[PDB]
Design a protein around this ligand. Sequence first.
Ligand SMILES: Nc1ncnc2c1ncn2[C@@H]1O[C@H](COP(=O)(O)OP(=O)(O)NP(=O)(O)O)[C@@H](O)[C@H]1O
Ligand SMILES: Nc1ncnc2c1ncn2[C@@H]1O[C@H](COP(=O)(O)OP(=O)(O)NP(=O)(O)O)[C@@H](O)[C@H]1O
Ligand SMILES: [Mg+2]
Ligand SMILES: [Mg+2]
Lengths: 82, 492, 82, 82, 466, 312
Amino acid sequence: LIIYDDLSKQAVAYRQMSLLLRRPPGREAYPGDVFYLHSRLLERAAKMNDAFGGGSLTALPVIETQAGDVSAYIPTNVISIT
Amino acid sequence: ADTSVDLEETGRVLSIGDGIARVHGLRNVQAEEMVEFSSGLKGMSLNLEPDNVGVVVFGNDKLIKEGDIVKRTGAIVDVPVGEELLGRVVDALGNAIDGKGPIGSKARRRVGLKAPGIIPRISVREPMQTGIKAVDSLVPIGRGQRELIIGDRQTGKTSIAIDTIINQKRFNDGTDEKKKLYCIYVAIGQKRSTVAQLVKRLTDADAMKYTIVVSATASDAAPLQYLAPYSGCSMGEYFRDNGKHALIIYDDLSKQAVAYRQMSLLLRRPPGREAYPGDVFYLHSRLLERAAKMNDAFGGGSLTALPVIETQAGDVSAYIPTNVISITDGQIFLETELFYKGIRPAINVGLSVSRVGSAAQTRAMKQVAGTMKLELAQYREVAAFAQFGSDLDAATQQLLSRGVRLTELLKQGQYSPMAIEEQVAVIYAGVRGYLDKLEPSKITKFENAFLSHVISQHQALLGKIRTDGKISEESDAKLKEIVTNFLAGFEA
Amino acid sequence: DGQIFLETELFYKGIRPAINVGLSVSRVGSAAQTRAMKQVAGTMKLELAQYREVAAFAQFGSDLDAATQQLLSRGVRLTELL
Amino acid sequence: IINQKRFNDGTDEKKKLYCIYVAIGQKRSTVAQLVKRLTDADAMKYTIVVSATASDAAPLQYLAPYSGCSMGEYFRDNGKHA
Amino acid sequence: TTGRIVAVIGAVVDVQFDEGLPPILNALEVQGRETRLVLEVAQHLGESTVRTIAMDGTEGLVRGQKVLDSGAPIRIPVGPETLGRIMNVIGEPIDERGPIKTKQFAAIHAEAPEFVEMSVEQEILVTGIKVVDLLAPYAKGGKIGLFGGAGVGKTVLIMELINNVAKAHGGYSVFAGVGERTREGNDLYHEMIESGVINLKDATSKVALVYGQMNEPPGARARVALTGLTVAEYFRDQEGQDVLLFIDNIFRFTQAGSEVSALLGRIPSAVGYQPTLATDMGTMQERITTTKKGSITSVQAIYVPADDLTDPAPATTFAHLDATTVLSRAIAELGIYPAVDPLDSTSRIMDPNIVGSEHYDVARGVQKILQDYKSLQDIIAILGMDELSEEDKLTVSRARKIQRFLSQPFQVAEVFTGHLGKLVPLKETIKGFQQILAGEYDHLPEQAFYMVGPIEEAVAKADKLA
Amino acid sequence: TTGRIVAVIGAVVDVQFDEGLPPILNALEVQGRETRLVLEVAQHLGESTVRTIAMDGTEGLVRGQKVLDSGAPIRIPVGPETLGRIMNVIGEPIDERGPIKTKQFAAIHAEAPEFVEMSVEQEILVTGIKVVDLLAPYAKGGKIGLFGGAGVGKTVLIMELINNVAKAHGGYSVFAGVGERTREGNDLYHEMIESGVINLKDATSKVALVYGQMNEPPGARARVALTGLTVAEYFRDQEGQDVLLFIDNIFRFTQAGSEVSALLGRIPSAVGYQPTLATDMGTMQERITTTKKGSITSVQAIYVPADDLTDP
Ligand SMILES: Nc1ncnc2c1ncn2[C@@H]1O[C@H](COP(=O)(O)OP(=O)(O)NP(=O)(O)O)[C@@H](O)[C@H]1O
Ligand SMILES: Nc1ncnc2c1ncn2[C@@H]1O[C@H](COP(=O)(O)OP(=O)(O)NP(=O)(O)O)[C@@H](O)[C@H]1O
Ligand SMILES: [Mg+2]
Ligand SMILES: [Mg+2]
């Protein structure tokens, strides 16, 4: 069982690099592949069949919202991701 | 040094993508001069730079590579015009898309022309008949005038246009050239099925014969959608400048707006209000000015415009809608709250006004619509209270009675337009009280009944309003005759 | 070192100068006043701030103990005086 | 500015308050009504009026607050109150 | 000397002069054109190149086409010989009656009158419009701004105002159509010929017309306001009279600027506007003024985009004004006309020392009774009127009667609202609203005050309802 | 021909050909990699360079690596033996069940039906379900918005629709999962076999599955809705069926395309969306209509953001 505390803060840490590598900015200054940053991280959690040992990884992302706004770009990403 | 390719009449293309093609050479092309590509595709020379020509592509950018040979045409973006288009469906450029061979075009006109100045005009006077009761009575449109259809999606916008087009056949079936009306329907950003299902409907109503359809649907390239209205506008101006009367319908400018916003943002022009470029007002300003009513010295021809605007959730204060309010000579609002209620056409009477269209209404209509507009505001004088039956006053309970009948009467079926005298006859019914007794549940049924009766039996009485353009004391009393005995006979 | 805020509502309601007693402040305070002004304005600002609040809360028809009637009577008079 | 007439028409020298009214990007006619108003009330005499009105180029309007603040600084540094 | 076009983007043209480079604001002439395409210089780009903003359509321009400096900014006819004549931005007449014959010409670019030249006289101008003359009354030779969103009542109000003041005026009048509808000129021209203010047979003509409607390209709309006000400038300085200047629409000046600013090579400001909005408006607006040599009464209708009164365009325009009359859609949709917001409109003249303390105390009373009604409007919005106190129930009832007594049937409104137009004398307006405030009419119904002239017509209107 | 990698930036790769250039939208094969990598030409930057958008991870890429133009857009297996198969955006079978042996391969891009090939008739696709056919009838060759996700048996309604079209009209269906969660992909797979529509033994299958999973780059999520549409387009024109096309979910197709336009470097439009939004929608949604040969009727699951219907 893994707990990413938190993904909103990794999203900030990624954004910095893109903006400074001079990749195009989007909504809230986030690059195009920030959905893609979290989509490939959280799909990695799965439950394998007895064919592959039957083991499992279970994911628990944390997202910090401001003023309860779950419609902010990053939260909107992770809500659909999960 | 050279014995082959020229750089004065030819280009090379330095880069292609984002819609624009940077062209190398073209030394003697003009601003907004049409150009050709090695793949048959045509472009507009929008930018003239020291080291390149910026060309807008009227089609799929995938067909163009770096190194393609670009050729001049010399003519500034022009379109095939004339009468050889009536009954045809063409693209934004003017090419036949109905597969019925080519146009036999004997004339061409520029897409980027200026509107007639102050002197070549005169205040609208000729009746542009919609065939819809609620419009022709309360929101009278005149020939040479711009009237806006505006409202949320799926509220009957398009239907007002088409019934007006179907309506004009009653004039074009005549021989009187000075009362006929030719039509142009410009489809932008729609579904190709919606356009195709429209020309079929127009055909099944013998309307297409006097109609030109310009189609640049959702699937078409963004600048095709951009060019489309202007192209067909010139096709309209032809009739205007010939002393004929034409009608253009832009369905719609909101979809042409996003198309041009795509162009401006791909071009990297400063995104402003709602990301729209600084000249989205201008985009619709220069176009709708071109609808005009010429004075007799200029030939007495008129271009009448009905542009369409799709609001989001009733928001008229929005950027694009407010602009078009400030372009057009009046509006027609279509509230979702009346449409999703059964009232069709869903015209907000308390918001829709036609500025220069009053002195272009039939006098016979003014005799009935004047005290209709008066009693309809007297009903709209807060009658939202509704539920009480007979628990209110005495003088105010009859205004609730009148209203709902004068409201039900304005309901009208699709694809069934009405002659101006056929309208003043059914409006006469409620406006005088000959419906006050009748159950509100029945007014629709009564109309069809009474309406086809005066069509069948009393063509003599109808012809005597039509010709006289006025409800004479003799016809008024002979009409009182008709409604009273029919009402008593009427089986609810 | 503080601000003076003016509202149209207060302006049109009659109050001129249209000073918002709640929003405006002075960071130097009584130290900027004569000992004559301090003897009459020493607690007046925080008094009227409490009055402006209890004025909009007491308009709900609730029977008011004389102690909150006293502050209501004083606040109306001092607003007219300024 | 008009309340300073008392202190400026008396013997007291360390109660003298000199005035700088700096107009930024305003209507010239308005600035003219203003200086008339002061001359009618005879307060204009102890009042410098720095003007960079709407018709003046932006770079000048940018500078006008600072310029008057130097003119105030003269009083500030040389034992006067502005 | 000659200059060659090296670049063409939109209405922004780049001309390269090998010999003697022309200065900023100079008017250039393009050769090889069917009609006079004027380019006005905006900047020097270096390397013998200038940047200019066109005065017409740029379609059909070849990279190389020769251009010739005219050693002067754009020049136009001025003086009495322009009265009864319509001209475009560059001075070319457009009423097809031959060219305009004068001796005197002027440049459409000029400095603003020096601080010394400003006037300080403040005197009221009666209009006969109740909502205006009471709460935000215009002053002779003052700056009048008519704010309004799309279709709210500007062009109708400014037309009524002409019919009221311009017709019954001794001196001359200048109208400047800026970026509005072309038929709005064909309406005004034929209506004015009819009223005699424009005379075609002789030259007793009183109004001068200049147009640059929404058919004209940005460049033309950008400078056409200057054209008009320059015609007005002359009648103020060179003849020293009472000029009336009318402008519709003043927004199209900054809008046109917005359209070219991008291409000029600026970086976009707020709302994607020209960064130069602040000063672009200043230098142009400060000219439209009353001086010590003459007086201009300036009525300028102001288009508000997206009903946003905070948009940099209408919000910067306030600062240039003496009287602001704000038209509100909400008011209009309540069937109140003129749709003037009686609490957002202000006049610098509202000072008991000018209008009289009797005028002032009725204006401050009407505003107080309306501000109180507006502040109760959030409680009645949910509860309904039934729930108010017996003290407040009265103030509501009066404020509503006042609201409708602020509405008025205009003479230009006749030909579609069916009601006979009305002008109300100032003593009748003040005495009118005093009586409603005094409680003399607490018995008359509200609708009796709706769309009537003097207060004596409310009494008449109430009697009708039997 | 051959081109070299000049630039690798995130999911956007630049490739320089010496001689002739691949037209915009032509698929590119990156050589020497572990699996298959496709680069879709988006722009021509000049100087014989193209700007491509990858459909898979761009790690381990060397500047100068040889890239092959396929001379055509992204070509995918089409034909009856694509039914009961899980496909990805580039045609590859992702069900580990052996390569899809179809006779024809078709490019995922193609122009919308001409004005002449349109159906002037408006007909009703009878679903067999009562609520639908009576109150909210589906238009044959139209487009239907499906509101609300799982927890009410969304998956079922879809499957029954597949069954009943195959039953009543003899027309196949295609599920295009845009932004499919891999758990939900697996779960939807076995739910279709367990119920009868996918037949792992014989050829009685009624659906073709295309999966644009979430853990795939914006290029793959933006184009999979086409890879599904093209498999459905075969059954409209080549076999003349009344086809059924499921997109779940359409919003993640819009957000996919917004990411791409954000990546290429285009100035964003209103609310952060792409400037090409109108067309990005038009060039796909206009392939879904009734032609002379057949018809595709599409059911699309919609996500509305901030429950805002005015959201672009
Ligand atoms: N008078 C009428 N009576 C009955 N139905 C009507 C009437 N007018 C329109 N409709 C129906 O209502 C729907 C909307 O009409 P329409 O002319 O498409 O308005 P619209 O605003 O142009 N829709 P859209 O352009 O897609 O946003 C159509 O599907 C018609 O079937
Ligand atoms: N005093 C009035 N009485 C009655 N109706 C009025 C009055 N003023 C305006 N209206 C109506 O409201 C509309 C708006 O008038 P208008 O003069 O066009 O304002 P506007 O802000 O200049 N319009 P626009 O230039 O398009 O933004 C007109 O069509 C009139 O029918
Ligand atoms: Mg429609
Ligand atoms: Mg107007």
